[PDB]
Amino acid sequence: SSFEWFGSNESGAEFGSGNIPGVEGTDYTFPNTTAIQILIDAGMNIFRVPFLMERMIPTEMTGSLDTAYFEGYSEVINYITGKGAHAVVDPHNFGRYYGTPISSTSDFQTFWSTLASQFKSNDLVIFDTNNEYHDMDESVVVALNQAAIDGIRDAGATTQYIFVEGNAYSGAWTWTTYNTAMVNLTDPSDLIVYEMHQYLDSDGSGTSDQCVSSTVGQERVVDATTWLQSNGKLGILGEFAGGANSVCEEAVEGMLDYLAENSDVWLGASWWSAGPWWQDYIYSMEPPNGIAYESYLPILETYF
Numbered sequence: 001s002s003f004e005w006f007g008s009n010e011s012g013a014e015f016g017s018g019n020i021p022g023v024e025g026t027d028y029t030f031p032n033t034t035a036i037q038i039l040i041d042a043g044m045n046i047f048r049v050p051f052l053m054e055r056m057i058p059t060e061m062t063g064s065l066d067t068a069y070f071e072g073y074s075e076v077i078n079y080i081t082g083k084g085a086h087a088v089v090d091p092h093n094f095g096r097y098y099g100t101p102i103s104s105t106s107d108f109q110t111f112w113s114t115l116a117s118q119f120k121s122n123d124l125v126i127f128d129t130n131n132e133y134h135d136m137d138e139s140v141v142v143a144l145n146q147a148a149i150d151g152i153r154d155a156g157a158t159t160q161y162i163f164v165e166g167n168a169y170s171g172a173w174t175w176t177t178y179n180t181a182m183v184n185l186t187d188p189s190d191l192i193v194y195e196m197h198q199y200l201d202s203d204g205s206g207t208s209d210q211c212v213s214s215t216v217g218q219e220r221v222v223d224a225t226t227w228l229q230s231n232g233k234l235g236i237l238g239e240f241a242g243g244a245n246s247v248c249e250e251a252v253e254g255m256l257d258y259l260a261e262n263s264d265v266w267l268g269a270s271w272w273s274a275g276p277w278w279q280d281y282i283y284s285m286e287p288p289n290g291i292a293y294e295s296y297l298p299i300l301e302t303y304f
């Protein structure tokens with residue numbers, strides 16, 4: 001292999017974000033375990049599974065677990081890890097709860113204790129503090145990541161890796177601009193990995209199948225790599241995608257090339273995304289039909 005990890009996001013349980021709590025099979029759905037097996041069969045060994053905070057612990061983030069939503073969610077997590085792959089537990093929330101930016105470190109830490117308690121003995125679980133903090137003050141974002149860490153560990157979830165995420169959608173290309181204060185994160189178990197996202201379209205939003213250039217991928221992860229090398233941190237590219245065309249594919253190959261050459265900071269990547277409701281989606285990695293599945297899986301498998 002080139003990386004310690006390589007996998008895909010498995011979306012569905014976070015869809016219908018406009019509808020809280022929402023109803024399974026209408027607003028949202030869970031990932032298909034059979035389809036995950038196919039990607040395991042192909043050589044993928046880590047799976048990031050988004051979910052909404054408000055659906056997991058309704059009303060208040062110090063509250064109790066929704067039994068139904070948590071069992072739909074855990075069934076997928078226990079399938080991934082029961083097959084010996086890592087499962088990334090991902091509250092897909094942008095640093096906001098019911099749309100308000102999160103500003104209580106003690107409440108966020110209570111949220112994470114409650115959640116991380118239900119997974120404390122599954123070493124294959126990874127905890128992801130929050131998906132893409134944005135438009136919040138840097139200090140608050142940093143403290144929230146430290147709150148999550150504290151609630152995870154104090155819940156006894158002490159062997160699992162913790163993916164922490166930066167401000168500014170935790171993009172790699174803006175990391176040294178917004179997220180230099182994220183060095184000051186500690187963890188008693190010392191298993192912090194910095195999870196960065198990188199898309200290759202003009203604004204980096206990853207909503208287009210067009211890339212800026214066949215070198216834009218590596219160009220957008222060089223700064224972030226020297227920050228990890230300099231300050232002695234580990235990184236994982238938690239989301240990345242390209243359109244099904246040659247220029248994009250060249251840019252993903254050149255970025256992954258660069259990351260794999262720097263294996264000593266970069267532990268791997270995860271594609272955005274797989275999951276059973278993507279259909280026509282320009283980045284769908286979901287078998288048997290997904291546009292990325294046909295075009296990129298043959299490419300990415302070179303790095304497994």
Ligand SMILES: *[C@@H]1O[C@H](CO)[C@@H](O[C@@H]2O[C@H](CO)[C@@H](O)[C@H](O)[C@H]2NC(C)=O)[C@H](O)[C@H]1NC(C)=O
Nearest residue numbers: 032033034035036038275276277286287288289
């Ligand atoms: C989950 O994934 C499996 C594997 O892709 C899907 O099974 C396929 O289902 C369609 C028709 O329903 C068939 O064309 C394929 O032959 C099936 N492949 C199998 C069984 O390996 C299954 O439909 C998916 N379930 C969902 C999306 O709910």
